[PDB]
Amino acid sequence: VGRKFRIGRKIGDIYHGTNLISGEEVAIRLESIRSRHPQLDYESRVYRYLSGGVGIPFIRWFGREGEYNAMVIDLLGPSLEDLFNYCHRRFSFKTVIMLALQMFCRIQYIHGRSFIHRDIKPDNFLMGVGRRGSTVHVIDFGLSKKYRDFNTHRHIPYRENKSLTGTARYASVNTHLGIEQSRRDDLESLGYVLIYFCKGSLPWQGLKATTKKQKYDRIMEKKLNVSVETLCSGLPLEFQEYMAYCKNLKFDEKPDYLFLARLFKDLSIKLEYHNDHLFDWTMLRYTKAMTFNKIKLLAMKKFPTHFHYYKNEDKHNPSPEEIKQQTILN
Numbered sequence: 001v002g003r004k005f006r007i008g009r010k011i012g013d014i015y016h017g018t019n020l021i022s023g024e025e026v027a028i029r030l031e032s033i034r035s036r037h038p039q040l041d042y043e044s045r046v047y048r049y050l051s052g053g054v055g056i057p058f059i060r061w062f063g064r065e066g067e068y069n070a071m072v073i074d075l076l077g078p079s080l081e082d083l084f085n086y087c088h089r090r091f092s093f094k095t096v097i098m099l100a101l102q103m104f105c106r107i108q109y110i111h112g113r114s115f116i117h118r119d120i121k122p123d124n125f126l127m128g129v130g131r132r133g134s135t136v137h138v139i140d141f142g143l144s145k146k147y148r149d150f151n152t153h154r155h156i157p158y159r160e161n162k163s164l165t166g167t168a169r170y171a172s173v174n175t176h177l178g179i180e181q182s183r184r185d186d187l188e189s190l191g192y193v194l195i196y197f198c199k200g201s202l203p204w205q206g207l208k209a210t211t212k213k214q215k216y217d218r219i220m221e222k223k224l225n226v227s228v229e230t231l232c233s234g235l236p237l238e239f240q241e242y243m244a245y246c247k248n249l250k251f252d253e254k255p256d257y258l259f260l261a262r263l264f265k266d267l268s269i270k271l272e273y274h275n276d277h278l279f280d281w282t283m284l285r286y287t288k289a290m291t292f293n294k295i296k297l298l299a300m301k302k303f304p305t306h307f308h309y310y311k312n313e314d315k316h317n318p319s320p321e322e323i324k325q326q327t328i329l330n
């Protein structure tokens with residue numbers, strides 16, 4: 001039903017859909033007019049302005065279908081959180097770095113297009129269905145705002161006392177303080193996600209509360225009490241360096257994107273990694289083609305170079321060479 005793709009299995013408000021014209025697969029969402037505070041049309045406009053860039057979902061059609069407005073995107077495979085779960089909530093350093101690299105360029109592009117995503121969670125990073133199944137795409141711009149005016153490139157004025165949006169686990173510290181969000185906050189959230197991929201957990205998730213605000217404040221307290229080098233407890237120098245730079249950015253200040261890109265790329269070169277686009281889930285699926293704790297042990301012995309991990313008890317800054325000894329182990 002609908003115009004003019006047919007919606008099917010629920011993957012709501014997101015449903016699996018079929019292009020009747022071609023047979024192409026379609027991810028289609030419809031909002032619920034008029035409650036509560038629907039914004040789908042605005043998001044569709046954001047997509048339209050952002051189109052042309054890599055890792056940007058393509059809106060086939062947006063309009064009003066029957067009662068509800070509908071947005072239509074081509075299918076984009078699993079999120080990085082679903083792949084996170086598929087790899088037992090832990091990524092190898094090669095995957096994390098490669099994900100961080102593409103994520104950098106995607107987020108850079110958005111900032112180049114004068115916007116900021118302001119959500120940045122693994123749930124909002126989807127891979128793709130086919131040939132573009134190696135690329136990383138970005139979704140949900142419902143909270144996105146343009147930070148600089150388009151022609152004049154003038155930054156939006158400084159504001160405070162506002163609420164936080166939207167997920168506290170990956171939220172910036174400044175956002176908890178009710179500070180207007182700049183580019184720096186997108187990058188800080190990104191850093192939180194990278195640690196989330198390395199360790200598999202964050203110090204503030206899994207807390208106790210009686211109300212949303214009390215929940216946010218408790219996460220806020222934990223984030224303030226945790227040092228930068230403490231949360232990068234078993235991670236290389238570049239991981240601390242990234243978070244240090246991002247938290248020390250002015251509101252108006254634009255990030256030196258190439259510096260953070262080189263930061264992770266040089267770390268990759270130190271570790272003798274490559275942009276093979278061979279991720280953890282890729283090689284895990286391949287070995288499984290021939291619980292899953294067995295498969296993981298097998299895949300490591302097959303590709304000893306690729307799989308390097310984080311040890312949960314370590315309070316340490318593992319040298320590139322130290323980590324490269326996990327290769328000779330497997």
Ligand SMILES: NCCNS(=O)(=O)c1ccc(Cl)c2ccncc12
Nearest residue numbers: 011014027073074075076078079139
């Ligand atoms: N792996 C979870 C799948 N996410 S999904 O199908 O609901 C999905 C949600 C939201 C958007 Cl914007 C999409 C875009 C393209 N493909 C799937 C999309």
